[PDB]
Amino acid sequence: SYYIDADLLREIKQHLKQQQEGLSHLISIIKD
Amino acid sequence: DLLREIKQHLKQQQEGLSHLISIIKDDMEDIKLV
Amino acid sequence: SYYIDADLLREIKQHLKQQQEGLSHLISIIK
Amino acid sequence: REIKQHLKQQQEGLSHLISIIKDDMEDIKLV
């Protein structure tokens, strides 16, 4: 089968966590 | 219904993002050594 | 030397593209 | 529309995300 370096999962998750915090802040804004 | 709409789309975006994060977390338990 | 199935990275990529489409939509809904 | 421009910030986020994934998918290993 075909494989890629797993370290990339780490990076992606980290960023998505931020992009997630951003959205929550964004919606909490308009809610305020 | 202008802010409602924006707000609704943001909630959907946030759902999709959470879904992707759960997919990644599941992937993170199928790592293989080579 | 640790790996994951390459298909799993493709799946992520498609979801990221969907996120992008939805994000460009909001931005366009202000336009 | 600091919101709009707050979204632009995020959409650029995904772009990086996607770009970095694309580069890694040029380095796939077959077993």
Side-chain angles (χ1 to χ4, degrees):
Chain A
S1 50
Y2 293 97
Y3 290 104
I4 185 60
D5 193 321
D7 284 337
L8 192 63
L9 284 169
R10 188 214 68 220
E11 189 157 319
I12 295 170
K13 192 229 240 294
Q14 279 185 339
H15 278 187
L16 291 185
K17 283 294 135 59
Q18 138 157 316
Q19 174 129 354
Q20 194 180 28
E21 283 134 31
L23 286 180
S24 185
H25 160 212
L26 176 46
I27 82 165
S28 186
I29 281 178
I30 67 89
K31 285 178 173 172
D32 287 331
Chain B
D1 216 88
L2 183 63
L3 292 172
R4 132 147 189 248
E5 189 187 6
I6 291 173
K7 190 174 118 78
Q8 144 147 205
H9 286 142
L10 290 160
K11 98 203 159 189
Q12 297 168 358
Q13 279 295 117
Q14 128 187 123
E15 183 197 302
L17 192 43
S18 179
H19 185 60
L20 177 55
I21 288 165
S22 299
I23 286 170
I24 291 169
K25 290 181 301 191
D26 192 65
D27 296 345
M28 285 171 165
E29 292 184 335
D30 287 352
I31 312 302
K32 293 213 205 176
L33 259 101
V34 168
Chain C
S1 165
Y2 300 96
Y3 298 95
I4 18 79
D5 179 352
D7 286 335
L8 291 171
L9 228 78
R10 138 283 256 176
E11 155 164 56
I12 296 172
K13 174 187 180 69
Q14 164 184 335
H15 276 99
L16 295 173
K17 282 167 174 187
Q18 273 260 321
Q19 284 296 111
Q20 239 180 223
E21 271 166 27
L23 224 51
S24 170
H25 214 151
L26 260 63
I27 296 170
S28 167
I29 275 166
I30 332 304
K31 261 169 94 104
Chain D
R1 270 144 56 228
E2 300 123 24
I3 281 186
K4 212 230 226 303
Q5 98 89 223
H6 248 323
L7 294 177
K8 294 179 182 303
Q9 285 179 356
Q10 289 193 28
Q11 191 157 218
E12 196 59 17
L14 302 179
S15 297
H16 219 184
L17 214 50
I18 276 175
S19 291
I20 280 63
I21 293 169
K22 282 167 180 168
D23 73 27
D24 274 23
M25 296 192 327
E26 309 177 24
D27 184 25
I28 295 317
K29 99 153 311 211
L30 171 55
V31 178

